[PDB]
Ligand binder design. Structure first.
Ligand SMILES: *[C@@H]1O[C@H](CO)[C@@H](O[C@@H]2O[C@H](CO)[C@@H](O[C@@H]3O[C@H](CO)[C@@H](O)[C@H](O)[C@@H]3O)[C@H](O)[C@H]2NC(C)=O)[C@H](O)[C@H]1NC(C)=O
Ligand SMILES: *[C@@H]1O[C@H](CO)[C@@H](O[C@@H]2O[C@H](CO)[C@@H](O)[C@H](O)[C@H]2NC(C)=O)[C@H](O)[C@H]1NC(C)=O
Ligand SMILES: *[C@@H]1O[C@H](CO)[C@@H](O[C@@H]2O[C@H](CO)[C@@H](O)[C@H](O)[C@H]2NC(C)=O)[C@H](O)[C@H]1NC(C)=O
Ligand SMILES: *[C@@H]1O[C@H](CO)[C@@H](O)[C@H](O)[C@H]1NC(C)=O
Ligand SMILES: *[C@@H]1O[C@H](CO)[C@@H](O)[C@H](O)[C@H]1NC(C)=O
Ligand SMILES: *[C@@H]1O[C@H](CO)[C@@H](O)[C@H](O)[C@H]1NC(C)=O
Ligand SMILES: *[C@@H]1O[C@H](CO)[C@@H](O)[C@H](O)[C@H]1NC(C)=O
Ligand SMILES: *[C@@H]1O[C@H](CO)[C@@H](O)[C@H](O)[C@H]1NC(C)=O
Ligand SMILES: *[C@@H]1O[C@H](CO)[C@@H](O)[C@H](O)[C@H]1NC(C)=O
Lengths: 207, 168, 317
């Protein structure tokens, strides 16, 4: 709903396609307006000179204008050709996101927007594609005392998943993306190294 | 407008900090344009500086709410172009300047952006230092981690061009 | 570029004849403006990747690592890190051809870079995707190893060795860049190629293209007006072609640079603000981290990976 309000209240948000269509329309309209340039000729119109000037003078000025009109076309094509390379690159990126985030949920970092990709949805547009990118972003977090391991019977007990945490009275195990502490048991930890190896190791009974 | 024994062009002369050989009545730069000239009646080497020029751009609020504007004259003095801000990005005429850091609204260049705050209130153009956001000097400790509890589902938009006008 | 100045400024007749070509150079003035705008957009895409600028802690608990060689040094006249300083000291008119200043200056780039580095060292991905989390370097290291399937005991057993390998490699990078200037070719070529294209445009102003004189404001003061008009038309066309050539080359080079900037921005996300497993994406090996550095006209990343060293042949099933 916020996206719909943003798009309708902030039409500048649509600039990625609106600027493209206006730039291409302007380039083509410029190509038309430049038909009026004389390039040194008495007149800018080829079909004016041919019925207006003494034929040998007309011939010279007509060729000058043909060259001028050609240059306008060459310019247009080169500019559209370079723009086409950028548009192709954009289209390739759009195709990439549609496969990776829409038909997927890519872990590429902040690829389809900040956060972990949960999903993405395409919408059509004149000259382009709109995506709704849905991500997972932490809302709240708290500072817990932590350790890579706990010390028990002289050994370092590591979480199978997560980090050891504490609120000041008891140690538990949690994941980096969510504070849902588990009881420290032999089903949740593994043993390797020792208590003289782990930096930050704390003393905690393993059940 | 200069002519020193047939050597011509335009610009501004100042004393140079370099010496020329007895056979060198002038010097040239990287693209062989005049760097300096010597005065045939008072030999002295005088550097030639291009006559002041630059582009001119206008900083404006939307005209739907207000019409105070200020103008940037690039690479020139505020006296060459009342409330004048001197910068290499161009002297902004019709604007003030404040030392404090703020966000960027309308870019001037070289680290400064204009914005439109009001004063006792009237709106004016003030040039400001860019802040790059709040300086979050977060401290860390080997025994403490910020661990997420709950989360938000954020949905944002991206729009990409796919195709151009099929000109024929 | 001011095309009136480049072709022939301060002349009524040159202006009137320049206008017979319509918007031929007006659109080029526009193309160059567009390129300059894109250059700031590229800079923002590559460096402004932190929600807000972040700063390093007052206490440099780097676990024995020297990140002082990568982070800008605030005590110097030029706030550049030792690597940035080596690079910055090596990567280097009246005719209407000028250069505009950046919006985002080297110092501000260094400030975003410092924030990115601060995260690279102590918060990882969180300076980007949400509120920053407090993830102290020693734990972030335990995580950098867990992220490639390696038990964090290697970090503690080898804490000194790991920091020393990093620090040693930084010294090697500094020694390489300081002795092999061609190593900086990725940015040196950009500045030299663009400067040469423009300096060539200036040198080419002197071509006559068959004209009686190579200078438009010489001809108008030397030739009988209609004779001057013919010679002027020939030189204006030649000068306009030089402007168009330059711009076309700059537009193509901009496309290559925009692509480079987009790749650089991607690497920042993949190896600076994360530890991507895309194979050899930000350098060969498994990613652990990456540290961005500023540069004139560019970005430098210090790519840190996990790479097997010694190995043995064991009986298997
Ligand atoms: C070309 O001839 C002119 C003649 O006007 C030379 O100018 C003269 O230069 C001499 C030597 O500097 C001046 O004599 C002394 O000048 C100083 C300061 O200018 C003064 O303090 C002394 O009392 C003494 O007058 C002389 O005034 C000056 N004449 C002027 C300025 O009218 C000039 O040097 C010659 N140039 C070359 C390239 O040969
Ligand atoms: C990081 O590198 C700097 C630069 O070499 C080290 O600073 C040197 O410190 C040693 C002794 O600690 C001195 O003898 C040198 O004179 C210092 N060099 C300079 C250029 O001042 C610094 O010790 C390193 N830090 C760590 C933690 O290794
Ligand atoms: C892995 O390679 C490292 C290289 O850093 C070895 O560390 C060196 O060990 C030798 C002798 O064992 C010492 O002379 C060096 O001083 C050590 N280097 C450092 C930087 O301390 C390490 O021993 C190797 N580990 C294994 C398991 O083979
Ligand atoms: C934890 O137990 C170890 C035995 O492995 C002991 O050496 C250490 O002193 C204990 N740490 C405490 C009590 O803080
Ligand atoms: C810490 O949490 C444990 C259980 O999660 C609880 O027993 C203990 O009271 C808590 N301590 C504090 C200080 O809240
Ligand atoms: C954390 O590091 C500080 C100094 O950087 C040290 O004083 C302290 O003992 C360390 N704490 C742990 C739990 O390793
Ligand atoms: C303005 O003039 C001063 C000296 O009068 C000079 O130092 C400065 O460079 C000039 N500023 C610009 C932007 O040209
Ligand atoms: C997340 O928990 C906080 C308290 O820590 C609460 O204020 C907030 O409403 C919760 N957010 C959501 C989306 O439930
Ligand atoms: C393992 O066997 C391969 C294949 O012959 C051999 O090339 C290699 O040297 C051996 N590696 C070790 C560590 O023995």
């Amino acid at each position: 709903g916020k996206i719909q309000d943003s798009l309708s209240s902030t039409p500048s948000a649509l600039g990625k396609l609106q600027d493209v269509v206006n730039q291409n329309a302007q380039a083509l309209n410029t190509l038309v307006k430049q038909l009026s340039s004389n390039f040194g000729a008495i007149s800018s119109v080829l079909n004016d000179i041919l019925s207006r000037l003494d034929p040998p003078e007309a011939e010279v000025q007509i060729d000058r204008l043909i060259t001028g009109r050609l240059q306008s076309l060459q310019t247009y094509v080169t500019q559209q050709l370079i723009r086409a390379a950028e548009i192709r690159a954009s289209a390739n990126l759009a195709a990439t996101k549609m496969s990776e985030c829409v038909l997927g949920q890519s872990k590429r970092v902040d690829f389809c927007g900040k956060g972990y990709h949960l999903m993405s949805f395409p919408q059509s547009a004149p000259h382009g594609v709109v995506f709704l990118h849905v991500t997972y972003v932490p809302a709240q977090e708290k500072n817990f005392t932590t350790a890579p391991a706990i010390c028990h019977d002289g050994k370092a007990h590591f979480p199978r998943e997560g980090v050891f945490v504490s609120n000041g009275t008891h140690w538990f195990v949690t994941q980096r993306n969510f504070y849902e502490p588990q009881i420290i048991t032999t089903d949740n930890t593994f043993v390797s190294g020792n208590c003289d190896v782990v930096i930050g190791i704390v003393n905690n009974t393993v059940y | 407008n200069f002519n020193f024994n047939g050597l011509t062009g335009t610009g501004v002369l100042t004393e140079s900090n370099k010496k020329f050989l007895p056979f060198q009545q002038f010097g040239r730069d990287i693209a062989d344009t005049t760097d300096a000239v010597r005065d045939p009646q008072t030999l002295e080497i005088l550097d030639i500086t291009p006559c002041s020029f630059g582009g001119v751009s206008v900083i404006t609020p939307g005209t739907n709410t207000s019409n105070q504007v200020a103008v940037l004259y690039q690479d020139v003095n505020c006296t060459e172009v009342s409330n004048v801000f001197q910068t290499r990005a161009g002297c902004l005429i019709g604007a003030e300047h404040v030392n404090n850091s703020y966000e960027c609204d309308i870019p001037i260049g070289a680290g400064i952006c204009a914005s439109y705050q009001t004063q006792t209130a009237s709106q004016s153009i003030i040039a400001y230092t860019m802040s790059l956001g709040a300086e979050n000097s977060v401290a860390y400790s080997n025994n403490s981690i910020a661990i997420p509890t709950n989360f938000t589902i954020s949905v944002t938009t991206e729009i990409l061009p796919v195709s151009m006008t099929k000109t024929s | 570029v001011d095309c009136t100045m480049y072709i022939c400024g301060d002349s009524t007749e040159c202006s009137n004849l320049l206008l017979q070509y319509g918007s031929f150079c007006t659109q080029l003035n526009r193309a160059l403006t567009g390129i300059a705008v894109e250059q700031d957009k590229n800079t923002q895409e590559v460096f402004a990747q932190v929600k807000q600028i972040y700063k390093t802690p007052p206490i440099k608990d780097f676990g024995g690592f020297n990140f002082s060689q990568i982070l800008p040094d605030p005590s110097k006249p030029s706030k550049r890190s030792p690597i940035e300083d080596l690079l910055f000291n090596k990567v280097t008119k009246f005719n209407g051809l000028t250069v505009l200043p950046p919006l985002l200056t080297d110092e501000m780039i260094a400030q975003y870079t410092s924030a990115l580095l601060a995260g690279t060292i102590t918060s990882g991905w969180t300076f980007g995707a949400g509120p920053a989390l407090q993830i102290p370097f020693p734990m972030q290291m335990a995580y950098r190893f867990n992220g490639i399937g390696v038990t964090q005991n290697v970090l503690y057993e080898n804490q000194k060795l790991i920091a020393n390998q990093f620090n040693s490699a930084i010294g090697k990078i500094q020694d390489s860049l300081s002795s092999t200037p061609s190593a900086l070719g990725k940015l040196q070529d950009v500045v030299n190629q663009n400067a040469q294209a423009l300096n060539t445009l200036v040198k080419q102003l002197s071509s006559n293209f068959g004209a009686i004189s190579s200078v438009l404001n010489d001809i108008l003061s030397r030739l009988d007006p209609p004779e001057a008009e013919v010679q002027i038309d020939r030189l204006i066309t030649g000068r306009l072609q030089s402007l168009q050539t330059y711009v076309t080359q700059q537009l193509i080079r901009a496309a290559e640079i925009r692509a480079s900037a987009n790749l650089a921005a991607t690497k920042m996300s993949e190896c600076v603000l994360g530890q991507s497993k895309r194979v050899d994406f930000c350098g060969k090996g498994y990613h652990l981290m990456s540290f961005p550095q500023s540069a004139p006209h560019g970005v430098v990343f210090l790519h840190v990976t996990y790479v097997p060293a010694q190995e043995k042949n064991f009986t298997t099933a």
